[PDB]
Design a protein around this ligand. Structure first.
Ligand SMILES: NC(=O)c1ccc[n+]([C@@H]2O[C@H](COP(=O)([O-])OP(=O)(O)OC[C@H]3O[C@@H](n4cnc5c(N)ncnc54)[C@H](O)[C@@H]3O)[C@@H](O)[C@H]2O)c1
Ligand SMILES: NC(=O)c1ccc[n+]([C@@H]2O[C@H](COP(=O)([O-])OP(=O)(O)OC[C@H]3O[C@@H](n4cnc5c(N)ncnc54)[C@H](O)[C@@H]3O)[C@@H](O)[C@H]2O)c1
Ligand code: NA
Ligand code: NA
Ligand code: NA
Ligand code: NA
Lengths: 331, 331
């Protein structure tokens, strides 16, 4: 706890960035006893707003915060960083086509991969939040071949937490009593929110979610659609995509990765596939994982039924489609 | 830690509200072992946005969070609450006159005083953030005569933290090493940011701020102007008033009040004056305080020089002027 961790947030002058940086400064990401230095990266049109954010961080008198670099220079932003949370991008607005959203975002990741690879600290842990999350991360990984493949991840923790919240609300139990949902595959409407291995603490012990809900039709239909469409639902309610919950879930992702998952719990992370669960290797794909010693490990040995298999493959195929589109934009 | 605390945030669909609610849900306001129930109050035009916020809070799967009421009904919002953070209001926009800002905001506090007085839990701790903070709080107190006078406060903790940050930056030391600035009086450009009693931890012990800075002209001039004008500086940088830092400082205010100040530290709180330091009684006025057992206590026995006296009286006079304007709007 004497030495500080350097944490980069790209897209720092945006909505998620604004929600996220004070959570990091308060110790929510790396623990209450871990000092942090923030590096905040955005682009020249947001230079004033970015300086504004730094002014606020200073103004909060955060005792764990030992420095703030606020910049539009990617080299400076990436120098010496130990954690990189990549939020820089352009959210889809009405009128944009899927190709334009892809093209505007993957170019960022191609470019910033070189800056991270050359300047970040060696065992830097990387989390891509910007959409399309898995594909942006895959592009980053491909353009930064010197970064250990296990050190690149994308955020499906918001999907995971959304799923936990849906179960909590459906049963009217506290969310702290629900665990071990799984989000398989892409951060998109093709994801598989899987409750086959999930549990709820009750007065008579841990029970499986399906036994308490007693409505397989709901779990297999509307529950899944609800999680798949939840980001669009936030936009409908707020006229803006999620931020408070994306930031909080990015803290959870990093925190669990670095400090470890609790005994008996697994969480979802988009990680570089190795062939586990017969998912094609070389995709950024969400798996159930446990974390220990700063490393993720896919939870092996879960039974997979026919319906689960088919959903897992469908989302893998979407990820291949996205990869092809990204490639198309970059050539 | 078994029983939850009910925390009301009014103005919950706004900028500060959005920054604040997830900090409460994470345990930053009342501690990592204290479950919370959120009540979020806003007005009918923000009903959709407010529901959006609740959706995000659910989606974050906060383990300390045991319920969220999101409403436009003040009676419902105030029912059973133990902490009330009042952020509901209208920030000054270019084109508004001082009378209009006052009139639009103090009417809220007149109205909501009755709802809190009738429905909040008996020892409910109240913090007014909305501007004009001290005067809104004074109006609330006057319209809720059954609330113990020591239970009504306003936020000068952001001013206090700003002052700490300025010292930290000027000396290039970590803010964790700086303490015991004092903000006297109004949350406004008439405040007195006082460093006469402040300290910095160094390698050769706690030293007074003036001894390390060695520039009394700066401390007595530009330092004070900088703190007095800092909110306007945020607006110039961001095109919006402070939020991340206001939320964080509201957490600090409540946390210190409820859990106690550290030994050797005092903090600033706008509280109901009792005649201490020859400040007129019956104003909401920022003082240096320590907190223990859920109660503030003004730090008595600080030496006050001639210049300090005059500044303390000038800000008291502004508060009287504001009070007269508020009265004028309410009759
Ligand atoms: N669970 C998830 O993975 C999840 C949830 C919500 C949003 N998102 C995505 O996160 C991203 C950010 O959302 P937001 O609401 O914060 O958007 P926003 O537009 O408010 O913020 C994005 C910021 O990125 C900046 N940016 C653009 N190009 C950049 C570059 N080259 N380097 C650094 N910064 C750059 C922009 O200036 C802007 O300040 C979006 O892509 C969004 O779709 C993902
Ligand atoms: N240190 C401080 O004390 C400090 C710092 C910054 C801002 N402020 C003040 O805090 C307030 C909020 O700032 P913001 O940026 O969040 O503004 P904002 O406009 O984004 O949010 C205010 C919210 O209050 C709501 N509101 C209006 N009337 C209401 C009522 N009767 N009941 C409940 N809600 C109501 C509005 O709909 C809006 O959602 C402003 O008055 C601002 O000047 C104080
Ligand atoms: Na079914
Ligand atoms: Na493996
Ligand atoms: Na002087
Ligand atoms: Na007293």
């Amino acid at each position: 706890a004497k030495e500080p961790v350097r944490v980069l947030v790209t897209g720092a002058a945006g909505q998620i960035g604004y929600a996220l940086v004070p959570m990091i400064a308060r110790g929510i990401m790396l623990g209450a006893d871990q000092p942090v230095i923030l590096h905040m990266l955005d682009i020249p049109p947001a230079a004033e707003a970015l300086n504004g954010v730094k002014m606020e961080l200073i103004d909060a008198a955060f005792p764990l915060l030992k420095g703030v670099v606020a910049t539009t220079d990617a080299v400076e932003g990436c120098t010496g960083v130990n954690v990189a949370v990549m939020v820089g991008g352009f959210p889809r607005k009405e009128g944009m086509e899927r190709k334009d959203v892809m093209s505007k975002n993957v170019s960022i990741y191609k470019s910033q991969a070189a800056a991270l690879e050359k300047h970040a600290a060696p065992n830097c842990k990387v989390l891509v939040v910007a959409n399309p999350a898995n594909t942006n991360a895959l592009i980053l990984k491909e353009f930064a071949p010197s970064i250990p493949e296990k050190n690149i991840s994308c955020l499906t923790r918001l999907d995971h937490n959304r799923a936990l919240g849906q179960i909590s609300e459906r049963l009217s139990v506290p969310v702290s009593d629900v665990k071990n949902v799984i989000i398989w595959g892409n951060h998109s409407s093709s994801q598989y929110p899987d409750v086959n291995h999930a549990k709820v603490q009750t007065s008579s012990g841990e029970k499986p979610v399906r036994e308490l809900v007693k409505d397989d039709a709901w779990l297999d239909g509307e529950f899944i659609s609800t999680v798949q469409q939840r980001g669009a639902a936030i936009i409908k309610a707020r006229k803006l995509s999620s931020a408070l919950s994306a930031a909080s879930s990015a803290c959870d992702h990093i925190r669990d990765w670095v400090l470890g998952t609790p005994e008996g719990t697994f969480v979802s992370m988009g990680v570089y596939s190795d062939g586990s669960y017969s998912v094609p290797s070389g995709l950024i794909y969400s798996f159930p994982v446990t974390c220990r010693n700063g490393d993720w490990s896919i939870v092996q040995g879960l039974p997979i039924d026919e319906v689960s298999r088919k959903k897992m493959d469908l989302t893998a195929e979407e990820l291949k489609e996205e990869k092809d589109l990204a490639y198309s934009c970059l050539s």
